[PDB]
């Protein structure tokens, strides 16, 4: 599934005010018991990444959000492998958990598919 | 370079089991391929001895 | 065939022969850098390997640096040892091989490190062009090899049989006893070079004043001036330098490095101003120029441009040393200007 | 080659030369920055940078006096160069600095200036001295938590944080008398100094000690500055070494000797007596290396270090490096070992006999506040060429041999393995 077509089903929840309020609350308590957050991570740091667009988007990030998902990801795997959690103090908060990869993602997939388009474009005479 | 690196058979051993780089964090349940390996091992010994005595 | 020792109760001895085949002197672009750097290469009775696997065992290394004006050959050793290194400096100067593979496998390699690691120190690149610009094509010949002009293994022998002569060279042992050292020179193959000519010319070479240079280059600014200096007004020139570099000038502070090169016909004195932005560079150059201008000294740093120029006990073949307490005021007249970086921000010779 | 020291009310230690043009004269204190603490660590260097000043500076360029301090880890010293002659003029200054203007030094708008400069200094060591910053670090992880773990130049954090009160609390606690030694070193002769400061009395501060701490212990541990910007690895790895005054002290620089330094790009280097130098000049392993034996008052490191753009085959590196190691338990030559006393004996002797007698001071001042005396240079000799192979191999057998290491290394590191597969090398299998 494309972040372009999550976007485009998220952004109608978020905009009408009768689903926004519906969702929203089981969305931020869905996120919660992910536990990501208790291993330092952010949302976007666990989106897969063996693949073309998230190539492209992570090489687009700038150097400081970079090796910030560096140690980011680091610090996941040694917390991991002690089983442990991460001190409270040092989890991810909200307002924090931010889709900073998100816009170098949507920018890649609109390239991407444009191409796909001019490479196929039919001619009517 | 090191022999276990030079050799043609050795590097095989050695990419595939020395040298094999491995994410720090996998947990025991990454060990039953191992695990598969050594149950083909006890088949086939354990088979080849009795087919010496099967009919 | 110059003899020089001074013995000592001290434990390691070292033998050197100075040579005179530096740039100054070299034939074609870099030579005297290949020459350099072809010593201790393999001779035609013991190999580069074997003279290495050799003195270890007793005790001692060799070195060849490379000057402006000079080639010298040195060996550091435990001192009972100095016939056996009297022999291998004279076995180099007499018969090294020049084999082609020497040329291509460890000299050219050596050499180009050389040059890489000159191309990236902007000072350097400055300091070379300021010897360029003044004097324009004796001691402003290139120190090292770039292939800008072709150098066959041919040319880097007749270089060798130029320079490697008696009547151009100067044997020099410190912490060794004349006595033996005289003895071993003349028993070994140092007496059968075949003396040629000394190349050491007395008459003042032909400099040039007002003249400027800007080189474009990616990494920190630099801008320079070099003055040439007379062979009898270099004294004032050195209680500059050591002026300019102590805590008595206000604007040490505002340079770099500043120092005058000694020759045997005269010299160069050199002034460098080093940043990472040009903007700071601009302004600490233009200040110098100015209170350079408006000169002005008294001597009080005649006790110490005395005793800075004493700590250099390697150099005791000096020229005047009594000819700094004369001279005590400086003023700035003609020099040359040299702008390294980012020159589309830096001082023309204009504007200072 | 005369070493001379008498004690009357403070202790003069000198060694003349009379072929010297110059003379040097200081004094020197038994503490340097392993005598500080996590938080005032960087105020011995902050008194050098002080004594090193514009102001001061200038006060003995008049005079035709030349500056010098060094900070080092045991002790700290402070330098005056001079002419033959004005060998009495250099201790005016010496004392006019350390008694007189004990208090116009440290005025606040020469400290801040001074400070400023000290920041910009060790900033700049930081972001480019990866070789000494690299073994700075291999000190600090080694001796963790101990006070050979402190670096010379102090830190950011500790220097930006220090006060005019902070340097006057230590010089009031370690520039005193009994932790102190008068040098002089160039061509003046014992009796010719030892009169002009018996001359001078007063006491100032006398019968006050320092303050005392832990003894300093190695730790096998690492650290590792991974910076995938820089163009290439450097590392340092290193065992418990020998303390200055031990009885192994001149075994271990023997057994450095025998690996030595190299330098790829030098035709020569590339040629000596070194086993090593088969197997890393096959893929070029490195760029260059170089072995030490560090010793210091209470314990030292022994060990290498080394600098590669070859980022895939660092592990090659220190395999090589570590088997050779191994040999020295279990089969070094005869000849390995008479190649290094040579080569020991060359290097020892450019070291304690340089045309710099800046240079003979720190030594004989450093080595006369440890064992109260200095081992001349022919005495050194007498001890590196009665070592034998059964001395080397009793030697390694302790210290190098299944013994925990110290590792430290900034730079493209992801090459260098893991902790434990660098210790397993430490060794051999054998039946
Ligand atoms: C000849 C070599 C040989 C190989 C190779 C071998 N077997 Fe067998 N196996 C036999 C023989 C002989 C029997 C009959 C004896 C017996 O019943 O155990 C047998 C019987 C079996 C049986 C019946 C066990 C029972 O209840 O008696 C199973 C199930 C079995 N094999 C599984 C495997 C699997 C799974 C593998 C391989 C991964 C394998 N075998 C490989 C020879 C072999
Ligand atoms: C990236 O992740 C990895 C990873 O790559 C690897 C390699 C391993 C390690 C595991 C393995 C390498 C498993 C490999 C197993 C095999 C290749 C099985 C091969 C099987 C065989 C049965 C070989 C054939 C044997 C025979 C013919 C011998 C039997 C006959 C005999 C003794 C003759 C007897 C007769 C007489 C007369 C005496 C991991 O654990 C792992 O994750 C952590």
Redesign the interface.
């Given at each position: 599934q494309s972040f372009t077509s999550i976007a485009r089903i998220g952004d109608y929840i978020l905009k009408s005010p009768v689903l926004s309020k519906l969702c929203v609350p089981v969305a931020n308590q869905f996120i919660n018991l992910a536990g990501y957050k208790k291993l330092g991570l952010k949302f976007d740091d666990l989106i897969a990444e063996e693949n073309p667009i998230m190539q492209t988007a992570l090489r687009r990030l700038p150097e400081d959000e970079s090796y910030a998902r560096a140690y980011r990801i680091i610090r996941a795997?040694?917390t991991?492998?002690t089983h442990h959690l991460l001190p409270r103090n040092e989890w991810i908060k909200a307002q924090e958990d931010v889709p900073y990869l998100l816009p170098y993602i949507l920018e890649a997939e609109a390239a991407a598919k444009e191409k796909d388009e001019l490479d196929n474009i039919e001619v009517s005479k | 370079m090191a022999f276990r690196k030079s050799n043609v058979y050795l590097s095989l051993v050695n990419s595939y089991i020395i040298d094999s780089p491995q994410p720090s964090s996998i947990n025991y349940w990454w060990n039953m391929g191992s695990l598969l390996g050594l149950c083909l091992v006890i088949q086939i010994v354990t088979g080849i001895f009795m087919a010496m005595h099967y009919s | 065939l110059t003899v020089s020792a001074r013995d000592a109760p001290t434990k390691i001895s070292t033998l050197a022969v100075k040579v005179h085949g530096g740039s100054r002197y070299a034939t074609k672009d870099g030579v005297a850098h290949l020459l350099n750097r072809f010593n201790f290469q393999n001779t035609n009775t013991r190999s580069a390997l074997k003279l290495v696997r050799e003195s270890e065992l007793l005790g001692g290394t060799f070195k060849s640096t490379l000057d402006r004006e000079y080639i010298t050959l040195k060996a550091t050793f435990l001192k009972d040892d100095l016939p056996y290194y009297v022999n291998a400096l004279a076995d180099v100067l007499y018969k090294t091989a020049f084999k082609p593979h020497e040329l291509t496998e460890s000299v050219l390699p050596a050499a180009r490190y050389d040059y890489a690691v000159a191309e990236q120190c902007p000072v350097k690149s400055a300091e070379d062009q300021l010897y360029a610009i003044t004097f324009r094509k004796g001691l402003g010949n290139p120190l090292l090899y770039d292939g800008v002009e072709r150098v066959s293994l041919q040319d880097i022998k007749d270089f060798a049989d130029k320079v490697y002569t008696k009547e151009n060279l100067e044997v020099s042992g410190e912490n060794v006893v004349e006595a033996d050292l005289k003895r071993f020179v003349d028993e070994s193959l140092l007496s059968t070079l075949p003396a040629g000519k000394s190349l050491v010319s007395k008459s003042e070479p032909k400099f040039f004043l007002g003249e400027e240079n800007r080189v474009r280059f990616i990494g920190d600014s630099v801008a320079a001036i070099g003055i040439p200096v007379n062979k009898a007004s270099l004294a004032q020139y050195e209680v500059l330098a050591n002026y300019l570099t102590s805590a008595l000038s206000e604007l040490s502070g505002l340079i770099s490095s500043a120092k005058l090169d000694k020759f045997t016909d005269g010299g160069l004195f050199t002034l460098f101003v080093r940043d990472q932005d040009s903007a700071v560079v601009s302004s600490n150059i233009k200040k110098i120029v100015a209170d350079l201008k408006k000169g002005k000294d008294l001597s009080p740093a005649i006790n110490y441009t005395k005793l800075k120029n004493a700590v250099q006990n390697e150099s005791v073949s000096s020229p005047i040393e009594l000819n700094f307490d004369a001279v005590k005021d400086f003023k700035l007249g003609k020099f040359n200007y040299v702008a390294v970086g980012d020159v589309s921000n830096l001082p023309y010779l204009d504007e200072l | 080659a005369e070493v001379t020291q008498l004690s009357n009310g403070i202790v003069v230690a000198t060694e003349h030369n009379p072929s010297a043009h110059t003379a040097s004269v200081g004094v020197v204190f038994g503490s340097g920055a392993a005598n500080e603490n996590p938080y005032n660590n960087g105020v011995s260097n902050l008194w050098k940078n002080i004594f090193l000043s514009k102001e001061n500076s200038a006060v003995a360029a008049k005079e035709g006096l030349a500056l010098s301090s060094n900070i080092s880890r045991d002790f700290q010293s402070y330098i005056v160069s001079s002419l033959p002659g004005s060998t009495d003029k250099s201790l005016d200054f010496l004392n006019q600095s350390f008694i007189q203007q004990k208090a116009n030094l440290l005025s606040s708008s020469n400290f801040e200036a001074t400070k400023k400069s000290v920041l910009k200094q060790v900033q700049d060591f930081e972001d480019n001295d990866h070789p000494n910053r690299v073994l700075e670090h291999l000190h600090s992880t080694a001796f963790q938590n101990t006070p050979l773990s402190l670096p010379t130049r102090g830190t950011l954090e500790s220097l930006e944080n220090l006060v005019v009160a902070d340097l006057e609390s230590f010089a009031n606690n370690h520039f005193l008398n009994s932790n102190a030694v008068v040098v002089g070193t160039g061509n003046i002769k014992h009796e010719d100094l030892v009169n002009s400061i018996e001359s001078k009395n007063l006491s100032l501060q006398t019968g006050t000690k320092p303050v005392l701490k832990k003894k300093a212990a190695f730790l096998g541990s690492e650290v590792r500055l991974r910076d995938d910007t820089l163009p290439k690895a450097w590392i340092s790895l290193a065992v418990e070494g020998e303390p200055v005054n031990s009885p192994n002290y001149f075994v271990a620089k023997l057994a450095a000797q025998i690996f030595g330094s190299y330098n790829a790009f030098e035709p020569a280097s590339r040629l000596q007596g070194i086993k090593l130098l088969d197997n890393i000049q096959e893929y070029q392993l490195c760029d260059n290396f170089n072995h030490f034996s560090l010793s210091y008052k209470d314990s030292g490191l022994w060990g290498f270090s080394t600098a590669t753009r070859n980022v895939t085959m660092i592990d090659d590196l220190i395999h090589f490096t570590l088997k050779q190691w191994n040999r020295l338990t279990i089969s070094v030559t005869d000849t390995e070992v008479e190649r290094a006393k040579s080569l020991l004996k060359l290097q020892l002797g450019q070291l304690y006999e340089s045309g710099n007698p800046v240079n003979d001071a720190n030594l004989l001042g450093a080595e006369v506040l440890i064992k109260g005396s200095k081992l001349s240079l022919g005495e050194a000799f007498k001890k590196i060429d009665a070592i034998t192979v059964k001395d080397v191999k009793a030697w390694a057998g302790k210290r190098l041999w299944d013994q925990d290491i110290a590792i430290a290394g900034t730079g493209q590191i992801e090459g260098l393995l893991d902790y434990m597969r660098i210790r397993s090398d430490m060794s051999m299998m054998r039946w």
């Open positions: 795997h040694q991991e492998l | - | - | -």
